[PDB]
Symmetry: D3
Subunit: 293 residues, 6 copies
C-alpha cells in the first residue's frame, strides 16, 4: 500500500537482481503444483494467477498441476455418498471417481483457468483424457502391512511429451487436473503431488515448485533451528521415514523429479503472497531447494 | 450381424457412392450438435463417437457441441438445490451455474471425449473459458410479454475464430461445453443449439448438423404427408411460429447458421445408429436440409 | 441401379465397417499396380480412377504403377517394326524402346491421368527420367539355360525416395510409367510388376496391391478348393515353381515387397468393379494377402 | 577448341560483363520456346540443355515450351493415317491428337528431359493434363474468309499459376508439351508459340525467349539493312501484316506476351550454339528485343 | 548492498507491480537512445547493458541507438585535424566523416556490444551501410538566418523496416551507429537523437526512450515547480522555442516519433542507475512522458 | 574496352565453360581472404566487390575475411603511439588493440561493405564480438627460441557455426574483421590469414581462396620453372620451412584448412583484375591449388 515510501533506487535494484533468474528460466518449462491455502484464500489465489501470467509474459513456460482433496470429500457428503475405508484410505468406486473428476476438472480447474485468464488468453484446462495426453496405471496401497486395492486410483504411466510441449509452445498455460485413462480406457484419479513430479520429469522441466502450507523442510520438527534451505536427494531420501505424514508426498515428489533429472525441486510456503515470484526471482526465498546427489 | 449375406458387389457400390460427399467435405469444418437419445443410449453414443473418428480419418474436421439439460437438473435435485422459476424458466443463480458447468464440462463432455478417444488421440474438451476461445453476452427472456432476467444465461458473443481453427488443424476434435465468460469475466451457460449455430458461422463450417429425436421437419404435424426433406430459410422462417416448442430452438439455429453463410444446416434423426454417416455420405438421409433463400 | 431398395440401416453398417481400415491407412502410402482388363474396359477403368480419388479424399496416398505390354506390341505392328526373339522374349532395340516409351508414357499413362483428373487436380505422370526419380540396371534373361541379352530392359535400381514423397505430400497421385535411365543415362523399359514392388519398398508403403485377371492364388490350379486367401512368404516362395507362367511375376513382386518390409501385398481380381475399394475397406475381398514369415 | 590461346584477362572481362544480367534475372522466371534446328541438331540440342542447367545453377528459373510439328507429321505417315485439309490446315481428328500427344509428350519432350538431366535432377515433363496445370479452349481458323473447325486444336485458356510456380520453386525445370483439356476434359493440341506467350504471361516471366531459324526481325525482307534489334509493340503490331508466314506466329507471341506485361520478349537465332547464353548474358546478341509501347 | 534488510514481502510487491508493463511490452519494439553520462560512467554503462539483457530475457525487443559527439571531437584533436566552423557547427569534410564513422562504429558501438554480450549472444552492431538497412538525405543548417552546407551530415531517409525486424525476431539486439549512405552511396553522419525517432517510427516501436542528463522537462527552467511528468505533443510543440539548446534535439525527437504514431516517447534521467528499468516497470519514474494530442 | 572486336561465338564458349564450376559451387560456402594490393588499388577493389556480387547472384555463398596490417600501423603513427617490439613483433597493448579494432572494423571493413553494397543489399560487417560469433584464444610467439607474450593477439578459438550460416542463408555476405573476445570477454586481434582458415573449416566451406601479391607458389624461388599449380598437403607441409617469410602465413592457412576437410585451398594473384572469377570459373587460373594428401 504505502509502498511508494520506498526510494526508487531500491525498487530498481530489486528488479535488477531478478536478471540472473530471468536468464536461467528464459524459454524453459516450470511445473508448479498448486494446492493448500494458496488455493483457498482469494488474495493468494489472485496472486498465484498473476504470477503465472508474469512467467508467461517473461517467455517462461509454466505448467500448473492442481489437487483438491477436501473439495471432493465435501461434494461426496453433499451427494450423500457413503465412503468405504480400507486403512485410512477411501475406496474409489466408479461413483467416487465420477465425482472426483467432475469436482477437479469442472470446478477446481475452472476457477484457476478464469483467474489466470483475467490477464489474457493463457490458461487451458485438461486431463490425461484430452488428446491422450497421459495415461495412468492402477496403484495398490500397503496398509498395516498388506498391499490392498482401493479402487480407481493410480500413478501417471506415460506422458505425451511431444503433444504437451506443442501446447506450451503455442503460448498456453496448461492447468492440469490429474485424471487419466489406463490402457483399457478406464479413468483413474492420480495424486497431484506425484503427478506433478512425473510431468516435470517428462517435460524436461527446469524447476518443479511444490506449494505447501509450511516454511520449508524441518529435519527435527519442531526444532526451529532444524529448518534447512538446500538439501541433496541422498540426504533427503534417508530423512523421509522420519517426517510428518503431510510432508512425505511432497518429499517423494521432489526426490522422484530430481532423480529423474529435473535440476531442482522446491518446497515453498504457499501462505506467502507471490511465493512463486519470491522463490524464482529473489534470493530471499523461504522454501527448501532439492538438488541431485 | 448377418450382413455378410449381402453380395460384395453392392458393398462396393455403397462405398463408391460416398465419393462426391468425401470430395465436398474434404478439408472442411463440420459442426455437429450432439444431444437427445443419441447421448443417452450406449449403442448410439458409441456409433456417434465412431463417426467423429470416421470424419477425422477422412481429413474432415468435425467440431462437437453438446448440451445436457436433463443431467443438470438431476444433479440439482441430488444436491437439494431448490429452483426459482420465472415463466417456465429456472433462474440461473451463481450456484446453479457452478453445477451446470461442473456437469456439462466435468461429466457430460468427459464421456464423449473418452468414447471418441477410444479410436485415437482426437478429442479435446473445452469451454469458452479456455484460451478465451469465445465469450458470452447475458440474455434476457420474454415471458407472457415482458423481458425478464433469469440469471447467468446468455448467447455466444465473439468467437476466437483463429485459435479455434489452429486447434482443428492440429488434428483435434473439439468437444465443446457451452459456458463462456462475458466481458467482465463472469461465466454464463449458453443454450447448446444456438451455440452450435454461432460456432458453425464463426468457423466457416461447410455443414451444421443438429441431432434431434424426430424424423425431420413436419410442416403440419402430425400429418405424415407433411414431412419435408429440403426447405429454404425464407419458407422456414415464416413456418417457425407454428411448430412444437421442442422444434423451435433447432430451427432458429439452422436459420441463423444458414443466413450467416453456412451452406447447409441439417436436422437429422439422432435415434438412428450412425445417423451422421447416413446424412453425410448417403442420399438416403431421413433428415431435412436447410439452404439459403 | 435399384440399390435404393436396400434399407438405409445396412448402408450405414457398410460405411461404419470401413473405419478400422480408414485408421490403418490414414496418412500412408499405398502402391497399386494397374493392368489387365481393369485397364481395357471403360467401366472398370472409370471405377479404378474413382477409387484413386477416393483414397486421396481420405487422406491416403496412392501411387499408381502401370504396364501396357499388349499396346506396345500393337503399335510395333502398326509401325511395321519386325521383332527379334531370343527364347520367347522380344529383343528391345533402341527403336523398340522409343516405341515402348512413347506408348506407355504418351498414351497409356495419359488416359489414366485424365480419368483420375476428372475428379480433381490429382494425377501427375512420370517416368524415372523425370527429376531423376529412379534409375534402372540392365537385366539379362536366362533362356533354356543360358543368360542372354535382350536389349534395353532392366530392373529398378535406385529410387529417389525423398523426392517421390514430396510429390505425394503435395497431394499428387503419381502415375508411373516404368522407364528409367541407367547410370550412363540410357533409358530402359522395366517390367511393371517388379517396378511396383521396388517402389512400394522404397516408399515404405503400407500395402502393395496387384490388379490381375484371376480370383486369387490357387495352389493346385485348377482345383477350386485350392484357392487361398492369406499366405506367408515362406510358404509362397516355395510354391512359386509350380504356378502358371502368368502368375509368377505377380508372386515375385509380392515376395520381394513383403520381404522388403512392406506389411502386406495383395493379389486382387481386377475384373471386379471397385476391386480396390473392396480389398481395402471390406472383409469380403476376393484376393489373397501375403504377409512376412 | 584452341580457345586457350585467348588471354585470360579477356576471359575475365567476358565473365564480369555478365553481372548486370545475372542481377536482373536472379530469382526470376524465364520462359523459353524451343523449336527449329536448335531441336534437330545434336550439338545445338546439347548446348541448349546445358544453358538451361546454367540458368538453374545461377538461381534463375527457366521454363521450356517445345513444339514438334514435323515429327507429328512423320509419325502420321508412318502409321498410314491419311490427313484431311481445310485450307492449308490438317484437321485434328481424335486419332491425330492421340498421335500428336504421344509424339510430343512421349518422344520429343523425353529427349529434352534426358539431355537436361545429364547435368542434374532438374527436368520434369508435363502437359496441361498433369495436376490440371492448364486448360485449353477450342480454336477455329479463318480460311480464305470463313471461320472453320479443324478439330481438337486450341489456345491456352487458364493456367494454374500457383501450382506452376511451386514446381519451379522446388528447383525443377518444367518441360512443357502443349496439350491440355478443355472444360469438358477433352484434350486439345495447342500451338507451341502461342502457348509460350500465355505461360510467360501467367507466370509473371521476366523474359520470353523464342528460338527460331533466322537472325532476327527483318522489316523489309530481304533487305539486309532492314534488320532491327529493338522494336516496340506499337510499331511491331502494325508491321505484322507484311512479314513471311513463318514469322507471324512468333511475332504474335511476343506481342501478346509483352502487352500482357512481360517486360521483354526476344526473337533469337536458334542456329547459334548457346544462343540463350549470348542473348541473356552478353550485349552481342543477334536477336531482336520487343518492349511495350 | 544492505538491501537484504528489506522484508521479502515488499521485494515481492515490487516485482508483482511490474506485471502490467510486462504485458504491455511483451513482443514489442522499444527503441532506446543511449548517450550522456549513462555512456561515460562504468557503473551506469554496465547497468544499461544489463537492462537491455533484462528486456530481451522478457521477450521484449530493444533497439539501441547511440551517439558519441565528444569522442569524435577528441579523436579529431588527437589526429591534429583542424576544424572549419560555419555558425557553431563543424563542417563534416570527407576526412571528418571517416573519423566519425571509425569512432562511432569501431570504438563506441563496440564497447556497448561487449557489455551487453557479457550476458549472452545478443548484441549486434550496425550502420545504415550494412545490408542497406537505412539511407540518409543530406541536411542543410540555417545559421543566423541562411541555410548553409556543413558537409556530409544528414537525416535518416528510408529505413529497411522488413530487414530490421527480421534481425530483432532472430533475438538480436541491434546497436546502431548512425551513419548511412545517401542515394549515390556516399556516407553521411546522422544526429543520433533524430535517428532514434526515425527508427522508432519505422519499426512501429511501442516506446521511444531518450536517455539524457536531466530529471525531465522543465517548462520554466529553472523553477523547480515547473517540472512536468506527462505532456501532449500539441502543448510540447509550442513550448519548444523556449527551452535550453541542449533540450531541443531531444524534444524534436519525441515530437516527431509520437506524431509518427509511436504511442509514447520518454525523456528520462540517464544519471540514474537502471533508469530503463525504473521507467518501464515502475510508476516512480523521474522522466516525462510525451503522448499524442 | 575494344572487347567487342571478339567474335560472339567465343564469348559464348567462355560463358559455357563456367558451367561445371557453377554446378560444383551452387549452394556452397566459399571463404575469401582479401588483402594486399587487391585492397589498395581502386580498380582491383571494385572488381573484387563485383565478383562477390557475382557469386551471390549465382546462388553461391561467399564469406570475406580481411586484414589491414599497414593501415593499423599508419594510424598508430598518426596518433603518436610509440610501439614496443619483442623480436620483430609489435606488442599489442590495450591501446594498440582499440586502434586495431577501430581501423579494421570502422574503416577497412566499411569500405568493402560499401563497395559490395553498390550492387545490392548484400554486405554486412562483423567481428567475433557480434552475437558472440566466434571467440579467440591468446597466442604466444616464439622469438629467437623462447615463447613470449606480445599482448592481446590470438587465434580463433570456437566459431558459432550455426549462427554464421543463418546469416549467409539469409542472402548476406559477411565481411569479417578478425577481432574476437576470449573466454573472459577481453578482445584480441587475430591474424587474418589464420582466421580465414579457421572460418573456412568451421563453415564447411567448399573452397578457401587466399588473395596474395604473387603468381603462386614457387618451390625454389626465384627459379621461374619452379612454380607449381597443384600441390598436396603432405608435399606442401614439408616445403614450408624453405619459403619466404611473406608466404608462410598463407601456406599454413591452406594446410590447416585442407587438413581440416576443406576440399581445396587456393593461393591466387590478387594483382589480377577479377582474379576470383578467373580462379573459380576458368581453367586458366594463375594460382596454385592445395588438396589433401
Ligand atoms: Cl488439449 C488443448 N486444449 C486446448 C484449448 C485451446 C487451444 C489449444 C488446446 N489444446
Ligand atoms: Cl515430377 C512432377 N511432375 C509434376 C507436375 C505438377 C506438380 C508437381 C510435379 N512433379
Ligand atoms: Cl551479425 C548480423 N548483422 C546483420 C545486419 C543485417 C542483417 C543481419 C545481420 N546479422
Amino acid at each position: 500500500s504505502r509502498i511508494e515510501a520506498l526510494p526508487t533506487h531500491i525498487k530498481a535494484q530489486v528488479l535488477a537482481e531478478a536478471l540472473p533468474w530471468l536468464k536461467q528460466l528464459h524459454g524453459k518449462v516450470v511445473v508448479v503444483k498448486y494446492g493448500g491455502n494458496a488455493m483457498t484464500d482469494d488474495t493468494l489465489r489472485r496472486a498465484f494467477a498473476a504470477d503465472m501470467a508474469f512467467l508467461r509474459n517473461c517467455g517462461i513456460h509454466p505448467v500448473v498441476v492442481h489437487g483438491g482433496g477436501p473439495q471432493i470429500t465435501a461434494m461426496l457428503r453433499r451427494l450423500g455418498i457413503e465412503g468405504d475405508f480400507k486403512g485410512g484410505f477411501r475406496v474409489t468406486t466408479p461413483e467416487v471417481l465420477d465425482v472426483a473428476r467432475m469436482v477437479l476438472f469442472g470446478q477446481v480447474g475452472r476457477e484457476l483457468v478464469n483467474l489466470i485468464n483475467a490477464h489474457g488468453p493463457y490458461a487451458v484446462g485438461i486431463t490425461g483424457e484430452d488428446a491422450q495426453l497421459f495415461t495412468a496405471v492402477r496403484r495398490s496401497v500397503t496398509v498395516d502391512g498388506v498391499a490392498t486395492d482401493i479402487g480407481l486410483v493410480g500413478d501417471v504411466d506415460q506422458v505425451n511429451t511431444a503433444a504437451m510441449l506443442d501446447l506450451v509452445a503455442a503460448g498456453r498455460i496448461p492447468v492440469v487436473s490429474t485424471l487419466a485413462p489406463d490402457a483399457d480406457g478406464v479413468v483413474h484419479n492420480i495424486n497431484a503431488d506425484t503427478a506433478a513430479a512425473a510431468v516435470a520429469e517428462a517435460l524436461g522441466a527446469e524447476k518443479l515448485l511444490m506449494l505447501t502450507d509450511i516454511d520449508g523442510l524441518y529435519t527435527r520438527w519442531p526444532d526451529r533451528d532444524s529448518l534447512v534451505s538446500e538439501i541433496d536427494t541422498g540426504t533427503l531420501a534417508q530423512l523421509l521415514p522420519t517426517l510428518e505424514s503431510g510432508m512425505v508426498p511432497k518429499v517423494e515428489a521432489c526426490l522422484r523429479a530430481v532423480i529423474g533429472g529435473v535440476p531442482s525441486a522446491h518446497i515453498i510456503d504457499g501462505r506467502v503472497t507471490h511465493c512463486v515470484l519470491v522463490e524464482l526471482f529473489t534470493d530471499a526465498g523461504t522454501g527448501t531447494k532439492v538438488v541431485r546427489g
